Design a protein around this ligand. Structure first.
Ligand SMILES: Nc1ncnc2c1ncn2[C@@H]1O[C@H](COP(=O)(O)OP(=O)(O)OP(=O)(O)O)[C@@H](O)[C@H]1O
Ligand SMILES: Nc1ncnc2c1ncn2[C@@H]1O[C@H](COP(=O)(O)OP(=O)(O)O)[C@@H](O)[C@H]1O
Ligand SMILES: [Mg+2]
Lengths: 101, 191, 321, 190, 340
């Protein structure tokens, strides 16, 4: 995630010529990823639980307010960065992915 | 008692030493035969059959006896399951312990050289109180158990029922050699 | 032209014995694959996708032999890969398309032949995830680049047929957990037919990633070779061990012969090693080393008879002059 | 009691007795019972499988106990391939002294201030019921008494008549007296 | 004509002591290969595979001797390669084509003889596959050499420099490859495949017996060691060398033309001192060398450390005529009996 932060946003990457790894003793090509569109995707399995924890907190006790208790589709449709942070994504990466489809 | 923990090399898995020996098909019957101790033996015998129905199960017996019904749950489980149940007498196999020892697979019943094996008719399988009609019933049931045990013992030992009726009248203590000659065990281990 | 699914099995019976269900399954899938590769792949037509095969069977059942026989029949190149030769850490990508370098080298690096070839992956079950992900990305359509034959070369593996196989040892208990009443009960199921009813949930519980199951729609099962099939294997096939060693003795003036009990005993010995027909060669060579060293010295010999006592006991083959 | 936990570097957390079992040290502490003897047998069997050639160190601090329980340990010690070295800590009395003398000849040890006591067995079980039952249990106890004295005489390289005299009543011995008697081979100091 | 296996092994005994099963295996395989080439009637469906040989064994067991003796007897284009010098084609070192070049040079570049010769490759266990690299630019010395070697072991055509300074096309379909090496991890691989052991009274409980372990090698064990499966499948014949016993070590100590005993007797022949060993001395030297687990190489170390306190004094001791090395000199810290 940290290595993708600078790559997703504008930077000048140093890539190998289709031949080898990313070494110090390596010939390189400069590529500007400023105008390169990135589309990240993944099946956040445990995300529905996080969204349900945030939207149905409630509480325990005689004096507490118990909140009502909507499957993967409905919960994903209301996902927020807070849930993606609790899931494991760093905020620096979510800020670089403003559109959430 | 504190049961030691041992490490099995495979990664590593930590066992108590009895679960480690169960992993190699060794089942222990130690102390009196009770509903709970007999059901653990049955649970282990059933489990080991599922792990491998062909490999022998080693039933180590160090028991002064116990309940007949509890011992019969072990006995029927030993005869039912497909793998041979080899029996070994450590220290002592008395009463139902000697019965379960003789109940091992013929040719695979063992005893250690200084073990003590004792066979005898059953005592009270339960109290005989209440009315004379109740006492008659419990006396008849005890006699049926006595005959059943002597009959199964005679089958295990390749002896006549009349021989077991004589020899189980009072506590019959036997060395490993005498039990081998009698027919309770097949071999005596040394090394 | 192209061999029909019936002609494929006809020619494939000469090299492999048994496993008729897997034979017809491979024949149908391969015929359909190489008919799809003949479709008008342009215009407003339907873009056709391939159907891979998963061969489940014991060791020495003939999975690799099935794949190689199909390849020899259809003139396509073939290379066997091993999922055990792919490491978790490291560049799983860099070595997963090295198989493409191997396949290209088998066909003079002509991409036109390699892109329509066959690839067998050994020990598909021994990787029960990075290796699975790379095999998935490669089984699906992807353009990989490899070094030249001496500039880099491109290979699109969408049209390459993949036949994965392996001996799923603990799969049958995964199946019995749902097909039978119980395992440890008194009266409760104490112990290839169940391999034949294998369902995706069993392979997933075994530890195969679901996306890999999704690209292996054809599941074929191979039955263990019994003591009878291991005798035919010794005599019947085009490359039978008896035929090979009879040719070795036949370039000289000595006729090699086996007793039927010798074939049956040597087949039982191979079956006792849990390796199938793979162990047949070692025991046959052990049995015939008695004479392959002495035959150079022996003069006036006309035929050698290999009896069951040579295979079972330390007996010498009967030398009749 | 709270058994301390120790860390083995290789990390693996052991209780201190499992850690010592890893070093092939088996403890017999307190009375010899069916349960305490079977733990010793389980440890002896386990250690033979780990390494059939390396010595097993059997540390004994016991006032005695059941004869049949002690015989399960005794036969296991003699059966398993690796030598079982025995060491007396504090005391080895009755079956504890028997198992101490049962160690591999040349490897039976005692600490300098340990106390070793040998004696004929007491009741192996009650002698109630009818005179016929009492006769049977008396005969069995006499057979055990002779078996113990015979095995003790073998361990100590002494005559059976010597052990019959000396085990008549509680015979307490220092480590030096037990070494001279033949119960132990060496006395450890440092 | 073609030397038969009996003749082959009868002359291998002159240089290699022990390892009878391997000498039989190599002789039979070589005779079958040469006869198969002479009678290519196997062009019929029978696909008699090229019976290549894999020569596994401990260090000092006689792999490099079997290769040399087989070479100098067969009278055939024979090369001895070392995988420690082999590299990928695009890096510094010797690519696998240099072996074919040496094979041509061994036959006056007459390709007809080279295409039917033998290629011995020592230390092939040193090019096994390994995980992605520390020392990472490319695993050049490893799997790349295995693949370039496989491309030669199976029927292909190599292009090599001319006879002088126009490349020559050499088909290696009929070139026999004999690979060898001391697979140091193979005993652990086998001991993981087996050595299950057991626990309890009725179970069998139990230094690695690498002799019987090597005698039960399977292709998958060599795959675990790091060899590619397609190479092992091309090496069907597997010759195993046992650890030299006391008697074989004694014979090596005394019988060969350049035995250690004769070497030191001539080393003392530069002086005027006679060196004599007792039968018990040779027996104890063989035992101590076998205990070092270095094969016949551990024999020189023993004979050198037992004579060290003597070679230091020979030029100073005047009037000395004979020195006798007894069993006490080898087993105990004694001095050989000096005869003036
Ligand atoms: N079987 C043998 N017969 C006679 N001499 C032997 C034998 N094995 C080893 N030697 C002696 O050992 C010396 C070197 O052995 P050699 O080089 O053949 O071992 P190697 O198998 O090549 O070892 P490595 O695998 O370490 O290279 C030779 O000079 C020879 O005298
Ligand atoms: N069904 C079969 N018919 C003929 N030969 C077989 C068969 N199965 C295995 N073999 C022989 O076994 C050897 C190796 O088998 P292999 O292809 O490795 O089987 P698998 O791929 O199932 O492990 C081959 O040389 C082949 O001749
Ligand atoms: Mg060498």
């Amino acid at each position: 995630q940290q290595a993708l932060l600078k790559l997703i946003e504008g930077t000048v990457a140093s890539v190998p010529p289709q031949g080898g790894r990313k070494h110090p003793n390596q010939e390189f090509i400069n590529v500007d990823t400023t105008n390169i569109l990135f589309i990240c995707g993944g099946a956040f399995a445990g995300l529905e639980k996080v969204i349900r924890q945030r939207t149905e907190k409630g509480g325990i006790g005689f004096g507490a307010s118990v909140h009502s208790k909507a499957d993967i589709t409905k919960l994903f449709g209301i996902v927020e960065p807070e849930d993606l942070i609790k899931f494991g994504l760093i905020p620096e990466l979510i800020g670089r992915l403003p559109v959430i489809a | 008692y504190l049961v030691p923990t041992v490490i099995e090399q495979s990664g590593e898995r930590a066992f108590d030493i009895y679960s480690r020996l169960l992993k190699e098909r060794i089942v222990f019957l130690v102390g009196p035969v009770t509903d709970e101790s007999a059901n653990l033996v049955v649970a282990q015998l059933l489990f080991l059959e599922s792990e491998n129905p062909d490999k022998d199960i080693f039933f180590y017996i160090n028991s002064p006896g116990g309940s007949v019904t509890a011992g019969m749950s072990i006995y029927d489980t030993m005869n039912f399951i497909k793998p041979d149940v080899s029996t070994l007498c450590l220290g002592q196999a008395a009463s139902m312990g000697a019965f379960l020892l003789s109940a091992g697979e013929k040719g695979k019943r063992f005893a250690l050289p200084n073990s003590r094996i004792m066979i005898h008719q059953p005592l009270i399988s339960g109290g005989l109180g209440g009315q004379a009609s109740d006492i008659e019933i419990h006396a008849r049931e005890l006699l049926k158990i006595k005959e059943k045990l002597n009959r199964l013992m005679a089958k295990h030992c390749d002896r006549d029922l009349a021989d077991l009726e004589r020899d189980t009248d009072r506590d019959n203590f036997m060395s490993a050699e005498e039990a081998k000659e009698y027919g309770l065990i097949d071999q005596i281990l040394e090394n | 032209k192209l061999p029909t699914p019936a002609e494929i099995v006809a020619n494939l019976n000469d090299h492999v014995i048994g496993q008729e269900q897997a034979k017809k399954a491979l024949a149908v899938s391969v015929y359909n694959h190489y008919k799809r590769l003949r479709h008008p792949k342009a215009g407003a037509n339907v873009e056709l996708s391939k159907s891979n095969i998963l061969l489940i069977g014991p060791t020495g059942s003939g999975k690799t032999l099935l794949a190689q026989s199909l390849a020899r029949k259809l003139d396509v190149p073939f290379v066997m890969a091993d999922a055990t030769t792919l490491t978790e850490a490291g560049y799983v990508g860099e070595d997963v398309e090295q198989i493409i370098t191997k396949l290209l080298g088998k066909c003079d690096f002509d991409v036109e032949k390699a892109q329509r070839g066959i690839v067998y992956i050994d020990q598909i079950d021994k990787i029960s995830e990075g290796v699975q992900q790379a095999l998935l990305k490669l089984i699906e359509g992807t353009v990989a680049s490899v070094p030249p034959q001496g500039e880099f070369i491109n290979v699109d593996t969408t049209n390459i047929l993949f036949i994965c196989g392996g001996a799923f040892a603990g799969l049958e208990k995964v199946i019995r957990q749902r097909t039978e009443k119980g395992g440890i009960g008194f009266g409760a199921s104490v112990h290839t037919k169940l391999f034949g009813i294998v369902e995706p949930e069993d392979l997933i519980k075994f530890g195969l990633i679901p996306e890999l199951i999704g690209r292996l729609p054809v599941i074929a099962t191979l039955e263990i070779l019994d003591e009878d099939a291991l005798i035919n294997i010794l005599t019947e096939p085009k490359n039978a061990l008896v035929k090979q060693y009879q040719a070795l003795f036949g370039m000289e003036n000595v006729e090699l012969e086996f007793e039927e009990g010798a074939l049956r005993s040597i087949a039982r010995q191979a079956m006792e090693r849990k390796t199938g027909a793979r162990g047949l060669r070692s025991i046959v060579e052990r049995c015939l080393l008695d004479t392959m060293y002495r035959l150079p010295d022996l003069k006036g010999l006309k035929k050698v008879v290999v009896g069951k006592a040579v295979i079972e006991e330390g007996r010498e083959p009967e030398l009749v002059f």
